[PDB]
Design a protein around this ligand. Structure first.
Ligand code: ZDR
Ligand code: ZDR
Ligand code: ZDR
Ligand code: ZDR
Ligand code: ZDR
Ligand code: ZDR
Lengths: 301, 287, 287, 287, 287, 301
């Protein structure tokens, strides 16, 4: 043993974080009641540590229920498991909805207005207990995705060439607050057999691509029918997760723009299906999916 | 239902510890444990460890369920967490040791001054049929650096039991030393785990000797996969290293999650393992 | 003066336990105990129990003072608290049994895995004169379903001693079964307690048979009144139930504060009582 | 958890006093208080009293939880115990007085030379709706000797508040004086306590006049039952006795546990109550 | 290196206690102990006390190093701290006694209800050469009120051993009683400590009789200087007081740090010492 | 045993303080990490008890590492062993430096800015491991020392007569934030043989002298050479300690003012030497000495 005053004091400074674990189709998060302030109870660094699955609580991210902004019922902020802060989370907002209904003991259908870095999001707990969320309107303007790729269909990047590690892929870029790069295959290549991809190998090349200043989420898609899409995703700062709500919304948008599918689809994600719909009437995207509580606890900080 | 527990981890090998001192019957089923161990849909862990009432005079008894639901007969990293768990529940202070009854027999963990836990892991079992393994003993009834054909490739392995089965290898037959980090465990691991020569499956540790008192390893556990550490595995590989004449009885073993001090005493044939154990959080899971 | 103690209760029968292992003489007088037991002006309890040094080789000895100051020869709920008290003092975890000398002879409680205590309450005493009672034995020297005139009303009672005296009744002579909850204990109880047929007063338990293995009761204790439970009383009433042929040797007894598992083994003629015992608080009272 | 406290009693009205000067929020919940007040399964008391930090300039603040968990706005016997508590904690000897903020407003206890505590219990509230009661005021806005139909029987009552509600009766309508000891409180009491005419329930005191300066009473408290004494109740009944013209402003009130000196000063409308308070024991309870 | 320990003090006589139950040899050297005892450059203490494994059947053994590094054969204040120290390591509650092997023989401390410790300090050794002292016995084989020339000045002293040597004086030869607080210990003390008549040096206690059952003292310890208290010293001075006919066998001894109750029972010739012992802090020191 | 509800409640209401023990030339302190609050973790009364060498941890004082103030890396506050709070501590700030370096795992040379009651103090760990501290500039104005003695050399009190218990001594007063009374002997008397002084007897007479409203530290000095001074000190609220950093600085200032020594001196204190230099260039005083950790632990409050 070594004499180390530093280590001694470290193992003394204690803190505790109370939370509830939820998951939306396998995309699991640590939800914390932060309605007592507009400042997150923990730092991004602490969140990263708590998300470690072996040394911490383990999750794809930490979601804070914050006080409303501009009159919304609440505000939501989230930290990825890598510590970065994205502007929205689809599976997360569904868990957020149930987390709220539990904290307020609300029964039945209920909708809340949530302020997020992506704008106004409005989830509504259905009767079946599922959650249908108004993910807002998609951003197609290239520079606002943001991507340095040049719009090749208006100001939008649709099925445009992206050179990834020397290989030419075709991608479509759309933002749901956070950036998404959707691809249905390589340029001049066949359809994808999503399960045959080596995500941990190809994913990082898209995530940190120079054409995406704020990095990006990437979803690989294989069309099963014009109303049935299968996908896998490599998230910005979270890796290969079992599901991504904003990503499912973005890929349906991309599928429509590329003319491969209708505005209403059933997206099969690794952890399960989501019902997505891009209402042409208002240009809003609606996402319907489950959300479940797993356990609640107190972690050391 | 609800299950109250405390999350601990020994060098990254994380477990769900539950106070089951009121009954000799585990509070949850093996199936429930498997679900709780799912990292995305459950609490997430390599296993569930129950602190049970003593047996035949021991202070306590320990039972564990792997993340796949199977029940192994011992767990080194887990017993270290078990000792600290008891110390917390009983609010004990300072050095304390406990007698624990396990599927491997008597195990005695002792909390050190520095907060680590030195455990008497018992004695290694080398008789082939008791490991158990169907490989023939080539050194007495022990299997030492014997040929094992895995998916058509000949590897050399040594088998030793610490209650649970272990298959240790320092490389392929007629091959060079291993660069453990270059192995593709999820690919090679399952071939050892479910090998026909291991009736109850086996834990497998790949080792590269750094010195006669310093070994580096990686492990593919039975029913738990590639974990960050394995206490019984670190004990078994030191035994194998000694039997193969590659290292001394006292070694520092480097596992993915950190080091463990191992010593196989010739004076009594017992193996002592010293390492850390830390609480992470505590909670209540829905059942 | 100051008295350090720990408050325990067995099914609501609460006691003040004191560590008196330093002397075979109680730290306080019976008068002091009576004052400490007052629920408004004192600590409040049904009695004070002293853990004393062993006698004739027993691990310990137990003495108790009722809340009225009198000293009974045994206490079932109290001996269960006694066992847990010692365990807390000596850091005894898990199952443990102790030999205890009492005014009723040897008593051997054993802490169970679930924290309850199974006690070997010895053998019952049925000889009339030793209960003691002046009623004449009508079945050998035992008083079974014999007529007892209480305040001019004829009741049928069975007398049995568990060290202390018990008068068990299942109803009036030539009357129907009892609806125990309809009885006015503070009115009828004292008439049995100080009855001339009981030289040392007696404990009285009223019973209503629910089944041959399930009995419901209420008790008016000697010097303690209507308590929530009485261990020796539950044992005595099962004995009486068997002697009167109303129930079997193994019964669940429902007392106001909860259930007890009683069994009068025909194999050894011993009675076993199993039930809980819980610590409430510890303090110091002014003497 | 564990709660440290000191047991006190004022004429038999016993309480659990806790030093809560470190926070403005009670250390325990109302539910926990109810459990701690259980006399067999808990510490046993008529209530829990917290010594809290001053408010708007007062030396301290007091909050109390009845043994049923509800929170009344004041407690006479309790504030006297509160005075001794503080004096004991601050080591104050001799005459001393503190300003205490309560749900009834400012209350000022003063320890006398003889050791007893004289308390300025504030002024009585007589406006019906503020008591509160749904009975209609028949003497100004006050309810004095007004008819109250209890379980079909007509009683005459007077309502007055000392922060908490009180229903005082000297007998049934058109009936003779009461022989308070002949009443069956557990039977009649609950009918007043939960009467529909008392939205927040009420404390009820039954009185029999011995002389115009000597009153005897018994009380059925809201959420506490038949206690040995009630300070706010003794103040309220003197007020009622005066309003009904049965007694003078200065009286000796005999409560089951002892007497209290009460004076309703016409000079300032304040009521002063003088009585004892004594520590009994102290300890730590398990939560 | 690092040394984990707990700081305790008995009436101001402070020590560094270390859990040495693992080995029969002290974790640190006498030189290291001397350095750790330095109050400015080290932890600061009058000595280091090791809790060692039992010898010849005793529960434990105790060894101590003075702040100067020398090893005395016993320590009264220290054994009281030892008892409470062990109580924690064994998670014991309440009264409990331990048998301890020391260089003075068997010592039996017993924890009392008030947290104090009553210790059976064994029997005193009065045989001159066994104290040891070179002074000739003038009362049997004992040195009682014998002349000792210190730096040319004649003092009268009584020698007694409690395992360790003690030189007690009530004043100079042919001189008046002492006003202990007027002595200049750092000046006179060393002259006694290293006196040629004490081969193993000696502890010296200066005493002034207040009554035949009340003695006041100051002490200059061998290898520790002027400490706030000395348990063996208090025992020895009572023995000396009795032998010189100045006091009774039962006395209250006032030491700079506080009082001790000493009793030299004629019944068995054993000396009993009761005093406090308190933990101060837990620490790890650099070695 | 007496029934005491108060004593009972006091005993169960105990806390804990984690700390590290350091010493600078024998002047030992209890250092506590108080960077998470601008308020000291313990009261002055508690500090006094912890400093008791037999009933407590034992130290000349408690030093708190506090958060920076108006642009400093940290702030330092100290409580004497008697509980009073001085405005600075030389030996303590050197221990403070190593404490921080150890907590921040800083290796090699490092300097920090510290806010104290005497102003800005800047300790700098040297390459040799010693700590050289910029102790600031001395305060010589009589009323600001503070002392009621009249200035006899400008606004400064230099070799002025001080009647102590009827005996006339000559003293020089200087402040290093805290007050110092330096004397090289009695008025009209010979040089001092510092080791022959009876500090516990003479010290208190200076400490509580009526001419020192806030009490004072007193250092007795004997000149060995114009660059070598020997001293002993009786500190305000701490008694005869083995060393005093602010005291060593103050006595060099006094020695210079009285023309007895140069501006660069080696000062010998009971516990060891200190290198002191009063730079004429900037009027700042620099003190160089050691600091060592001894042990760490948790004390009951
Ligand atoms: C997949 C996701 N959780 C998105 C998380 C945010 C993403 N990792 C980002 O950094 O853009 C969701 O919408 O459900
Ligand atoms: C690695 C291990 N956790 C062993 C767990 C049991 C193993 N998975 C098996 O099935 O034998 C340990 O010893 O520390
Ligand atoms: C009911 C009892 N506490 C008996 C107490 C003794 C009884 N009051 C008596 O005087 O015999 C028990 O056995 O548990
Ligand atoms: C009788 C009482 N304790 C009152 C307690 C509060 C009462 N139970 C209520 O609920 O108003 C007092 O004033 O001394
Ligand atoms: C005073 C003492 N600590 C004795 C310590 C041993 C003594 N310094 C010696 O050397 O004999 C005690 O008995 O309490
Ligand atoms: C000697 C000192 N520790 C000063 C401590 C403060 C002094 N006791 C005072 O009260 O001014 C230092 O500067 O090193």
């Amino acid at each position: 043993e070594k004499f180390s005053p530093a280590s001694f004091l470290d193992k003394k400074e204690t803190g505790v974080l109370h939370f509830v674990k939820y998951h939306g189709l396998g995309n699991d998060f640590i939800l914390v009641d932060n309605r007592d302030s507009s400042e997150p109870k923990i730092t991004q660094e602490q969140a990263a540590k708590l998300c470690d699955r072996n040394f911490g609580v383990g999750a794809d991210g930490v979601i804070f229920a914050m006080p409303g902004v501009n009159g919304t019922d609440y505000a939501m902020r989230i930290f990825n498991s890598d510590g970065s802060e994205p502007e929205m989370c689809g599976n997360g907002v569904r868990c957020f909805a149930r987390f709220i209904a539990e904290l307020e003991n609300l029964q039945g259908k209920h909708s809340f207005t949530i302020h997020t870095g992506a704008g106004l999001i409005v989830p509504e707990i259905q009767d079946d207990g599922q959650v249908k969320v108004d993910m807002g309107t998609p951003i197609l303007k290239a520079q606002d995705v943001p991507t340095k790729l040049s719009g090749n269909k208006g100001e939008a990047v649709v099925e445009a060439e992206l050179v990834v590690d020397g290989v030419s892929w075709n991608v479509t870029c759309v933002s749901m607050g956070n950036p998404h790069c959707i691809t249905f295959g390589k340029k001049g290549g066949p359809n994808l057999k999503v399960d045959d991809l080596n995500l941990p190998e190809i994913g990082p090349k898209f995530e940190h691509h120079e054409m995406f200043p704020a990095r990006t989420n990437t979803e690989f898609v294989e069309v099963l029918s014009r109303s049935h899409l299968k996908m896998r995703v490599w998230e910005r700062g979270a890796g290969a997760t079992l599901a991504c709500g904003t990503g499912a919304c973005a890929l349906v948008v991309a599928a429509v723009l590329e003319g491969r599918a209708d505005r209403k689809c059933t997206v099969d994600l690794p952890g399960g299906p989501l019902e997505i719909e891009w209402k042409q009437e208002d240009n809003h995207i609606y996402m319907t999916g489950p959300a479940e509580a797993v356990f609640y606890g107190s972690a050391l900080l």
